Design a binder for these strands. Structure first.
Lengths: 117, 144, 51
RNA sequence: GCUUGAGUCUCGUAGAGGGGGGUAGAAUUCCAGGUGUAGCGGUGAAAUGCGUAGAGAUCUGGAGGAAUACCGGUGGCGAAGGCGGCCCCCUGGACGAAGACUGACGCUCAGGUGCGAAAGCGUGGGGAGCAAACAGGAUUAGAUACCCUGGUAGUCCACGCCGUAAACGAUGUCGACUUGGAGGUUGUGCCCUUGAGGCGUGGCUUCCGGAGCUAACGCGUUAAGUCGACCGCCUGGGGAGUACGGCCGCAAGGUUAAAACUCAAAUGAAUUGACGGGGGCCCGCACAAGCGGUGGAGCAUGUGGUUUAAUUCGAUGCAACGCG
């Protein structure tokens, strides 16, 4: 179906969850997979293992497109992200670019207070 | 074990088959320092195991014990960790013997002969203990 | 940031991420505007950097 | 009168000094649209919350507000509060080089006047994020908290008020003298520059230390050393920086400022120890790895209690309870 043959893997690692979205070069999503949607709810959805099985599961569900090349775009910090791109070249993809696209303000908005734990 | 790294003591092999593996199996089975009784039970049970399966003695034992050896075992985290080989077959024998004590047959040689026979086609209780351990270490795979 | 595919490679192993953004810069902008704790955190950081 | 104090002029230097105006780029939120699909978010774990009315992720376009990553530095500037993108306009101070000029014009300062973070107040705007109050979810014995999800005043602008802070180098201002070392920053002169040069002379500043001082801790040419001038303030702890009165303030409150009564201490620095849900290193059947027990049953024996005429006395966390 529609046979795009090149895409972008936007991986959005945060501290609590990694969410991998495989799209095309136009930016239209072709299929996604989160670490929290792969079993292991909770303290286990923020691990490199959960991110890699999230990326394995996002490599599935884009078989209908015949993607061979993809760029990787990485957001946020997280226990994910590093393992995530590994799972992508464990799934036959030719990984072309690895950009880190974490949003950094140039002293913009005030961050929240928190955490007197 | 706080300080002292240790050696280990050498067990005498089995007086019928020369197997230190099976010698540790009669030590796992032994209660109250009665070794003669336990080796009688092991010779009877493995003798009917060799007669039933028709293979041989300690390769029927080695198959029936090969089906129950654990692969890996498990804030409070239950991490999976790879079992050492001596601990591997030590756990194998402890689960066979414990499950054989759980059974409801007549004699201990029949309970353990039927438990090793149920472990030869891996359908007994010790294999459910191994699958249980492997479900715990398989569910919690996310910690390494 | 960006690293182009090499002609004969298995792992890109980009270190672009490490030299700048991940470790410090995003973990710093998770928490409060002070003016006060940074003046003392930098004061004791430059007072610790001593022989 | 005089120039060694103070000041003026010439030429430059560095600077987040101030006020006004403009602009730029990242990011957050919102709105509209494309793809796409079952979760997202959150936590120690959860739930509230958002989501098949299509969220989150992702791309495009727009709006708006605030703050200005990197440079960034015990770096700089300012009397202090404080001041951080870039550009323009108006403007204050400092420092340096040589020379000229005035000629003690100086120092401090009670009352007085001005400036004075943040929160707060008034009027009018603005309102993206954050967030007192507030609401819900948790946690808990309770939880009017810490944690989570939302969230209003406020934070932002204009003008006025307030007038305070651990407004702190807890160190008033001005001047003079008194061994050193390593830096930072900003001027400048000289000398093969023949480096990542050399040698000097100023301004501000950081760390360590000598004499000296100090209760000690420490300060140590930027003094808490050695002196001089003027000011401010102190006189045991509490009551109390409170009440009354005055002045100020829209208010909140600010400032000035007692007494009765009560205690024989309150305090500073340092020492020894003990302790810590502080840190480092180390041990023991301490935990872990195992095996067998106890707690359940009947009996033995000891104890507490009860009973009794008496149920002899003693032992009572560990280290009393088949103990004397």
């Amino acid at each position: 179906r529609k046979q795009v043959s090149d895409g972008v893997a936007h991986i959005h690692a945060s501290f609590n969850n990694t969410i991998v979205t495989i799209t095309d070069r136009q930016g239209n999503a072709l299929g996604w997979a989160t670490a929290g949607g792969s079993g292991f709810r909770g303290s286990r959805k923020s691990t490199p293992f959960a991110a890699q099985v999230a990326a394995e599961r996002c490599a599935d569900a884009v078989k209908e497109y015949g993607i061979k090349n993809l760029e990787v775009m990485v957001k946020g910090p997280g226990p994910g992200r590093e393992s995530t791109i590994r799972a992508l070249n464990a799934a036959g993809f030719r990984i072309t670019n690895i950009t880190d696209v974490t949003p950094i303000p140039h002293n913009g908005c005030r961050p929240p207070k928190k955490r007197r734990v | 074990p706080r300080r002292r790294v240790i050696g280990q003591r050498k067990i005498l092999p089995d007086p019928k088959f020369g197997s230190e593996l099976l010698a540790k199996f009669v030590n796992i089975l032994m209660v109250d320092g009665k070794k003669s009784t336990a080796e009688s039970i092991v010779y009877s049970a493995l003798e009917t195991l060799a007669q039933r399966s028709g293979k041989s003695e300690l390769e029927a034992f080695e198959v029936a014990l090969e089906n129950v050896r654990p692969t890996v075992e498990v804030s409070t985290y239950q991490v999976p960790v790879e079992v050492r080989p001596v601990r591997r077959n030590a756990l194998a024998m402890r689960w066979i013997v414990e499950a054989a004590r759980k059974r409801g047959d007549k004699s201990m040689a029949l309970r353990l002969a039927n438990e090793l026979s149920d472990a030869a086609e891996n359908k007994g209780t010790a294999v459910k203990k191994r699958e249980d351990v492997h479900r715990m270490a398989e569910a919690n795979k996310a910690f390494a | 940031i960006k690293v182009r595919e090499n002609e004969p490679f298995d792992v890109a192993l980009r270190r672009f991420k490490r030299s700048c953004e991940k470790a410090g810069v995003l973990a710093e902008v998770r928490r409060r505007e002070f003016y006060e704790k940074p003046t003392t955190e930098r004061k004791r950081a430059k007072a610790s950097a001593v022989k």
